[model samples]
Target: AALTRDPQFQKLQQWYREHRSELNLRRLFDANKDRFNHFSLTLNTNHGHILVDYSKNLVTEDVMRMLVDLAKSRGVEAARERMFNGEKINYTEGRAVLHVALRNRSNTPILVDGKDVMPEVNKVLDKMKSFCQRVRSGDWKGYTGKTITDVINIGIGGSDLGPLMVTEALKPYSSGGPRVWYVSNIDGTHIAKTLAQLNPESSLFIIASKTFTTQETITNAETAKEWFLQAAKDPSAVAKHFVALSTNTTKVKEFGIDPQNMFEFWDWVGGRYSLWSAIGLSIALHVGFDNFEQLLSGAHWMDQHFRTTPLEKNAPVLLALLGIWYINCFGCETHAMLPYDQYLHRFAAYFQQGDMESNGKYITKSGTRVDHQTGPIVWGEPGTNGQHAFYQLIHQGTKMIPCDFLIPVQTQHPIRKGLHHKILLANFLAQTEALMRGKSTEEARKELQAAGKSPEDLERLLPHKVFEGNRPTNSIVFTKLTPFMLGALVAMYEHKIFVQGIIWDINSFDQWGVELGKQLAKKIEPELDGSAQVTSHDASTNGLINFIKQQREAR
Candidate 1:
């Protein structure tokens, strides 16, 4: 089914073209005093409730209706069907986009080709479960028969960030388990510093890469392998101590990993999205399978809600459409995702890759240049802390950045200060309210007067202190940040990407942008090892390489 032919998409396109003129964020906020009330939508899930208040964005009630219509017109139903039913929705790779099915614990008959894959999925999961039990319970031992004390994960990007973030977010659950460490960067300094803290025998390393062939992951994996062999004194010890989350059986064997011990996931899962797949091996291992299921069930609940609900009330649909209204109509170049909970500090960085890698496309599905901007640069940090840092620019800067300030009413780790939760949440609530209705000159003058500043002093500081009212912000509130809630939270943004891809008429499943950089890096890297020198290269590459080589030789 053609996405453009869908009734909802047609309605969205028609509405967008017709109402393009009055779509500025400042104007929308001005015309609608109860805008926040109108824009806030909620969904009840297994983890808890998710409130998406896009009222701070540039969309009106009418604009939202049209955007919802667009979602339907784009065959969101059929696309979602193709995804779950194991059809090749990722047309570029000719693979099924079934990361959703990874969480399917119900053993419902799901097929890839003609065979049910749930049994196979569970087979790998069972291996992971048994292995986690051994390591966590001290049954799995080092070569000297000593129980492992630390587990180090040596992989970059998805392998590192997703598990690192989720495990850190759920740290309270992991206090009894082996100390978990991750070293992802290729920088020798990172590996050098990390290795200094651990005895190799007591540390177990999980080398995770889908192909067993990423340069950074492999380099770190080899370094870790060599470091362990120093203590164990044999290549066979690698199998007992080092396991891999990879499907590349041949490479797994070549790297001395036991094929029986290797965890597997399909090529359909992209690295950024693979946290739900075998890449989540470390997550499941760290926090236990039950908590892992909590994460999965939470995401599954959101998947159902996003798949069935109307776009107007749908959290993902509303977020994506609001993003479109701002970026396309209101000239917003960036979107900020601020999570107030200190534990979710990396929440923003996780989405930076998720949103940008998925939708930073310049061409439509037909391969023509898109007139409309796709995804905006996603940037932000934790609140209260951010208030001291970049909140200065957000408060008074000229650039329009529509931000989402996410907060949980319940604290996971409480500090027993006087009204700490109250004060922290008060700042969260106050920032959104203040950003919407900034201080007027009269309000500023009175505040200054009450603070004992002279009238002349007020005039001098007022320009610097004045907040340009009408800056838009969305307040996302949750009950808590449990493992289940964290799953729902991450899945929330995943669905948002899906909705935006439908509206933009682009294939969100494929990422052609990252390939160019990887290819270039591979090509130019040999010159550094003195294996090949490129005389035909551009001046920029040559200059940078020569400078690095000189610095290395000098050292």
Candidate 2:
């Protein structure tokens, strides 16, 4: 059945459509003196302290109650239980969504197909530890008998973004580790320029692909291999310098990488959620094995929270439902992930794929198209930079955008002047405050009058200066950015996407949406080789192909 057709959901939607006018952030605080106390909550986890302040959102007590009820009516808790217990919740792919098992730090048995996956998980983790230790300690040598000084990760999407983001974010902890580089683009320049500066004898490459057949990843990997072979002039050297993070042993062997060097993960691990798996080999190699383990431990702590916590008190659930409230009830089409930390500049881009790729589905579990909105258009950049760019529209635009403001209480790079962190935090705090308590027309007029503006000019500038004051935001404050904290933060959003999938009755795991473009690209690749006339494509595509061929012939 459609989620919109559910009796409880329908009632909730009707009530929201009718009562949305009264769901004002300014008025909610005005009516309730302790609204912040009631709405905001602090979560204590094994990783570290996190403070989630949702008091600035447009949700009130009654709306919160209704949203929770809507979640109940959609069987969110039951769906979560099924996922945690190793059921094939991702029915379309017939796979268990068990990225949780990758970080089963408690050693608890999680069965898929009636066998414990923990043993295999531990085995891979041990192998990662051993391999990382050898490479970092100079025990593992390249073809020229030199310790690897550089590491290049070759993969696309999750395989690329997760490791790249983590390594960049935790570059401070990499005092003794090798310099890490990542190549995800199929463009020759990406790998060409990266390898141009490095010694092929001292550079190690880790190719991350589940099937070893991701076109972009393999294309870049082949280019890298050619670069390495040109320098080494020995195919035997490939085994020493390259390892594979893949499940396909045959393909790994075909690529001339030793099958023993290949790390395996299960179908249960979705690409976007596979960082906690062996796909995080670059992470372990770049930050040391111990820090990588800490990352897993942090994710496991969040798994415990998501599995055991009540729906009302659950962090992921609350965040997910708040999103549902905005997207479905308030007609919000976009959500901004504005992180205040500079080290986490790519955090927004990482989740842009994470959330949008997971929940941007049109078909529901019932094999019918959904009548309601499923996912919001998620976008943002790091703060202060964002404050200068696009934040102007958010401050006064017509579109209602719900923003999650993520900032840490402390910074890793404390400046000598002690003014940098404070200034950044001030902007972080002021943005949420200004977003919630914006300048009213009266205030704008008074400020302009105080500035000695003429009457006509004041009238003209008042509208531009005035802000509506009810823009919703959620302030997520953490102590600092650590591996464990990053793990927890990423997992929190993963669970949030999962909860949204449950409520919307959509299959979040399978990404059939991305397959069509890849298939078409494959069909068109050979046509560009000029072997035969390309006639299969549409008029525009054929014309473009012919133009390319003509231009090439002219040259």
Candidate 3:
């Protein structure tokens, strides 16, 4: 089941290697008058309008057709169908990958294991709506009967990233709701710094862990509880300020949070994809439950598009095919996702976990090591910041990086009469153009001569200034950064992850790789506390532990 061993894929590789020399963006544009019209697609969904311009890429019509053919050859359609139908596509986990069902606004019955999960999904949504309304309406007060003014989210990975990103991106829509903070790290400074700025009487903490026993999350939650006790001087105050997003009712009650306050999601919801579940309580609390529902509706709209659209015209499928072409055929090892708006600064980091954790595997579904690469290293920051940073390597350095530039047509900050957004958009448009039609040596030399540079100086600066123009990039421009639009954008990438997983013949849901680190951390924490009856360690670990103990003893 090697992708490289497939005759069609092998032909694709051979053809790309041979044709790459002639695949210049400048030449592609020169020869085809309708290149942009053909390559770019405008999607008008329930959320808003989005323009996806992929004309700056090295792909031609024939290459796109062949990629679609490869997708069909790999049974991407069948895999996608299984995912939409609530099948147990995540075979290793023995659970259905049903994050899509959590946002099914149509209220359609989605069955798993001979039972419908729609009722439960709707039930949780109702609970979340009521809880968020109580908190945001100033009805949920703290120990002194003061309304909650600040909310802190304590969780790691998906529990933290999704809610934090959404709330921060939609801060303008808060409507004088509670300010939100997040503490995810095991480091004391993360919680300490956040709690230092808030009052215990006016703060609410949402502790999100599926099992209620994540070491980092529980430790942080314990520290937060101690901080609250320090101010309120009563254990009963914990019930008023702390809520749990977990399934373990016993642990939740033991921690002093009322069992009725615990919001529950299913076992099938993966941590990286759990934001749509009860994990989005912070999102609802910050921006009202109605906006949260709009977010879900937008994601459901994308789900519908991904379900019914043909492979050739599907946005997520096309995006996945383009990434596959760059990773498998062009031998590109990294992909950059650059969002233009500063509000979406964390969008790339969020997907870093979503993409890398899902597809960064070598073994296939058949349990054999693959002969081809699977996922590219996903990394980026907000642009024009990235323009002055690692973009140098992407422009003139050795590695081939295919990037996606996301731009919002309208800015949340409408001050200065659209001046700020115009500047950002200019930089956004200029970078993709600069990447596609890089400066030639002759153009550089002529510019130097026009500037009256000496011959020797011109020669010295010529090589430095010449840029190879065949770099590939895609532009994803949406109307605005509303809650619904944000939802659509996130779901698009989620489906893209599914498509890529299908083509790579890997299970996208199970994450056995993250387990070993957690196990080692659990074993090592007791060793650091001097409570372990037995200790086994490598030389480096033993040395590090001894040094820590020595430092503590000396103190």
Candidate 4:
């Protein structure tokens, strides 16, 4: 059934229209003594309890039930079951969406085309384990018999962001492993600056390209190879210094990396979800393979919860539903993921690709233009910092922007008798409170009167001070960030994205839109190879291309 066609959806739209005029969050709380208890949910985990407080979000029981019903009518349950069952649900990509399989610690039989994919998944993980073991133990030596002290990952998109985020997030967990770096951009400055800090003798390059032919990845890989070869002065050393996280061993071998070092992953793993595959070698190598296993285990826990829980109690489902409520009903086009932890600063950026790239489709499963919206513009930065930047817009902007405020209950750094974290926590709580229970004109007038303002001054000040705060937010409070906990957090967002895509009737696995730029760029790349006139593209592109030619050096 179509989402907008559902009677539940019609009821929701009617409810929104009726309540739009008087939707006061302050009243919602005043009217309900147990609003927080009713709206919030706590995820019990062995590692720690995760609190997802949606009381501040613009949702009532009626709104939630209707969203869940809409999800039910749209077959979210069936689609989720199919995804976990290893069916080719991503028919557009002709594969199963099985990043979940990569983290299936229970070793459950996830089949694709009547074959269990776990055996191969386990195989790649086992291979990664041995590789990381050797690398971490200082057994994996360079061409000159020096232990690896640095690892550079060269890939674009999923190949770069996921591992980078995890590695950075869990830096406290790094147990003297090789320092890691990433180079993904086609710009020479990216690789050039990265290579500047490296010792070729002690650096290992993990080339992560599924096909080993991604223009940016391969180009960067070639640059790294040239840089390595320049120092070693021996082509044989490339095998020792470089490994491929790819299925294309032919290209891997052709590029001087041994076929043995070419890790294998399947089409079932999407680029954005590729981190769990052998592509996470950089992750395993940086943070010990055991911690990496814990990352997998952590995600598997979320997978279990998402697969087993009812929509009413499901964390991912609720998030997806609340997001649907805002996007479809309240007309919110963007969502913010503001983490209070400095380590998790990149959390929003990683999901920008994870969520936006996955669900930013205009076409539905049947390839018709979507009648409704899909995928919010996901963006944010860490707290205390973002507290001063762009948050002004969120506090008073006419455009409604739903925000998720994430903070850890335990702080990694408790300097100055833990005052810093306490203040950070205070700010974190204050923002959500301020956003929800906004300053009314009456409250603003009282403050002005207390400050000894004249009647004329009070009137002028009241308008500016009055905050009509109906701003919605979800507060995700968890314990300290660990390999396991961060993994759960990432998977939580991952499943949230998938469920939203499910509701939107988007494949969420295929990335033809993402690939369109690459396809066009490939053609334009050669056209810019020499000082030649090419007007094949539109006038703007032709002008840009020729302008570059004129600016480019003579060949």
Candidate 5:
């Protein structure tokens, strides 16, 4: 009640109350035949691609205005300015969240501590460029004097997923790239499996832990180092084959990586948002420096967009506010990102962490516990797989799932014989339409009867076939998925998280949610190693760990 009494919540409730009757999806779609094109916004005019049509979502000009007003009333713009200006907005760690500067590819300056950090950021990227040039050209040889044939990313979370997704998104540019492998999970099976695929002498490992003390990454890195040293017969091979993406110079050097090989980022960058920094070493090594710059250029474009564009017309801002409206007012729980392209299968998981980890907080700026919900439970897979799997629930389920369907008009890798692009996009268009304009049981029964099914049989399956329409979705139709397009798309989401965090009155840059698990894991580590008794743990933890350890022997 107290939170609802706040001007922000009251304004939202007022808008919904006044417009609730007119906010039906099917009616709006039917009324405005050109809805998709009307709601869409174009970003770049390159290769005639990269447009997003979001008119399919449940919003009007009035709604957009009211939401932006609420954001202003809540100081969204001020919070964004504070973050950009290098204020210690991340209260938990007393650090400035400046992941934005990591991809600052332009001449414009951004300062931290009264000094521009772009020079240092570019310096690290330059080193990465030099290293990548040598490795990609096969000029840099390994311990046994063979050019490195494979690159292994040895870390978890952002260290692993960001590069993996980038590589998948830009596979066309990966023609001359070395084979890339990522070992993120602490399961011995992960590293063991990755190691089996390549000769140790021909594989380079990038250990990406900001602190160089991350348990899972260090353990895996040490294991990889041990495995390699036994075969290479030289400790110096570590400096040659291993590079560190960390700020801990002493630890990095002590761990056998040359200080020159220590590609560093600042405290301003959080783990989840560190991919644009030197944490992208694996990305540079996989794709050449030229294509890597393409990624940065793409992200840099969206950074300018977010920094300058007004909230009403901005793509990322509008998307974030629309989601916040549904999550805060309309009682939606989950947000889905369903890309029609097969190459983007892992994109949703990448966003799941980005969205959930950033805004999944309960405290507000004033240090009071929040009464309202924070972030949506983001989940999805590429379509038409989702159509076969969860389309039924989305179309007819009691819960409302606001979906964003990403479709590329042209495929980067076309089918050898025919036009699969049109068919793929046809399904993409049909799903959004189907979700909006569902068939009633009456319509389903009539169609069944027309197909020669008996009325009795129709009655039995009518409930199953009927789709209760009016589900909302946004259509993110891009011209194509190039390196720059993928970069822009990812940056769009990154800023979306930022804007939503602004509205929620929390620091999107810091992730306190991920810390509790680490704290708990520290307590469990002693027990697992027999330094402490296992009797302290609950039955569930004790059983799960025991089962995992028993299974660990083979891995």
Candidate 6:
């Protein structure tokens, strides 16, 4: 209730209203000359130094000060403590938002209901360690008695994206690990296409669903089992070919997976934030368990930073405030993540769930609709790939899309004596610089004149060539794309999303917004099973369903 009413909040609005025209990035840098030194931040993690150069964005020192105070008035620190202490801060679900406990490498106690969860956390970690080692060392054999060659993670959404993205990003580290594949879509094509490429005798499928009953996951698991059973010719072979990352052991055994093969996580580990839990079995299996521990340690290091640092210099808090500035003051609708490395191509799509699902809420935790914007539309693609496809829109479009330009200082594949990566780095620098200092009409006019264009041609082309360059972007640079650095970056963004929801007075942990569509899908699924005309839905939906059923029956 007090969010907009806070003195700092109003002060920020008033300041932006008055200074909006004068806060151009080009002039901001021209005036101060020390903007980067003052606005940007660098964190010294155990992995390496990660620099957050937010100087290119539309922010002033005064705005940052107000933003910090706004978070303070909105109760960020108190909320932070509650989350870290394992309090049931997810009030809607009445569950603790304790994902940080999964990476509590420091052995620090985090209590939930007067009991430390670190012990349970460690127990699962140890289980995963042994399991991954057994598989990687060729000790885990299929019913045919051959070592497992491929591992398939059958799940959807968080279970799918997290492991898929991590394994792809850390491909350089998986020298001897089993090949990893994912089957998430409920459509048979995804399963059929994936299984066509692998041998069922040497394939192990890890069914990742908390309830062991998620529609897409269970359906896919059943399809995968039928495929495996066809090859092995025995239902008992499921004990050798399949494992379950689920809480319901009864459902696990009913699916023919051995009870001993089930991996369990708790209610506190929500799907989107559950990659670090047993949901990450594929990740540990892909990149050796030791690298997985380094990943956890990196996230643990960031947990301490978010917990101990002041809001002003804190990396996550500062990033969140910057986001709030764009969202509330400027009305920017979308934020983009452009990772330079090809291996990290899925980085943005992965965070689409991480950021969007977490903060895309209008109702505050106080159970009232908010009068302000809550979250920006999160999006992006890889560096050079997005450059050719969408840079024109970003560079010249009227809409303001604040982008995060992420890159590693060193590339894993330094082909041609670093020629390619050097070119990649040059493009990375050129993009941020171009967005800040766009080509003016005069510059375009001069270029046309230098090319000896006819006077009429130059006159006509001048406006088309001109660029309004005061766009906003932040460049996040790290030493390399190590498992540790990737974990730190992922954790940093997770905390940033958490802090933004704290200031918005919304529950980031709960995702009631996603439930409505899911419910509707279940109702609509059975209607399409038959050729009878469907009238249970709206006119448009009924028409489409009836048309599809008519087409299907004729075929």
Q: CA lDDT of each candidate? A: 0.79, 0.89, 0.88, 0.90, 0.82, 0.90
Q: Which ranges in model 3 have alpha carbons more than 4 Å from their true place?
A: 530-535, 553-555
TM-score of each: 0.92, 0.98, 0.97, 0.97, 0.94, 0.98
What is candidate 5's lDDT per residue for 165-260, written digit by digit as tens? Answer: 888777777778888888999999999998888798789999998888778899999999999998998887887789999989999988888998
Question: Which residue pairs in candidate 6 collide?
Answer: none
lDDT of 5 at 124: 93
Model 5 clash number: 2
Candidate 1's error at 358, in angstroms? 1.1
Poorly placed runs, candidate 4 (over 4 Å): 532-534, 552-555
Question: Residue-wise lDDT of candidate 6 within 1-555, one digit each (tens)?
Answer: 546767888899999999999888988998998999999899988578899999998888888988999989888999999999999999999999988999999888989999999998899889999999999999988898899889999999877898899999999999999999999999889999999999988999999988787788898998898888888998888888899888678988888889888888888887889888899999999999999998888898898999999898999999899999999899999999999989998889999999999999888877888888987899899988888989999999889999999999999999899999999999999999998899999999999999999999999889999999999998999999999988889999999999999898988988886665556577788788866899977899999998888788683
Worst 10 residues of 1 by lDDT: 1-10
Residue 148, model 5: lDDT of 88
Per residue, candidate 3 scores C-alpha lDDT tens digits across 1-555 of 558667768778888978988899999999999999999888898567988888998889989988988888988988887877788888887878889999999988888887999999999999999988888888888999999999899999978899988888888889968989999999999999999899999999999988787889999999999989999998877889999998788988887888888999887788899889999999999998999998888899889988999988888998998999998888899899999888888999999999998888887888888888888899999988999989999998998999999988988888899988899999999889988899988999899999999999898888898987678999999999999998989999999988988888988898888855667676677788873333377878877887777777673
Better of 2 and 5 by TM-score: 2
Whole-model alpha-carbon lDDT for candidate 1: 0.79
The true-versus-predicted C-alpha distance at residue 129 of model 5, in Å, is 0.6
Looking at model 1, the pairs that clash are 6-73, 8-69, 8-70, 8-73, 9-70, 9-73
Q: For model 4, how does the per-residue alpha-carbon lDDT over 1-555 read when each residue is reduced to its tens digit?
A: 266777888898999999877777998899999999999999988998899999987777888888888888888899999999988988877889899999999997989999999999999899999999999998989999999999999999988999999999988878779999989999999999999999999999999988888899999998899989999999888889999999887888888888888889988999899888999999999999999999998899999999999988899999999999999888899999999999998899999999999999887877777888899999999997987988889987788999999999898778899999999999999999998888988999999999999999898778998888889899999987888888899999999999999888888998888777777676777787877788888999999888787878667
**Lowest lDDT block of 10, candidate 5:** 527-536
Candidate 1 Cα errors over 4 Å, as ranges: 1-37, 449-456, 530-535
Residue pair clashes in candidate 2: none
Residue pairs in candidate 3 whose N, alpha carbon or C atoms collide under 3 angstroms: none
Runs with alpha carbons beyond 4 Å of true place in candidate 5: 1-8, 45-48, 529-533, 538-555
| TM-score, candidate number 4 | 0.97
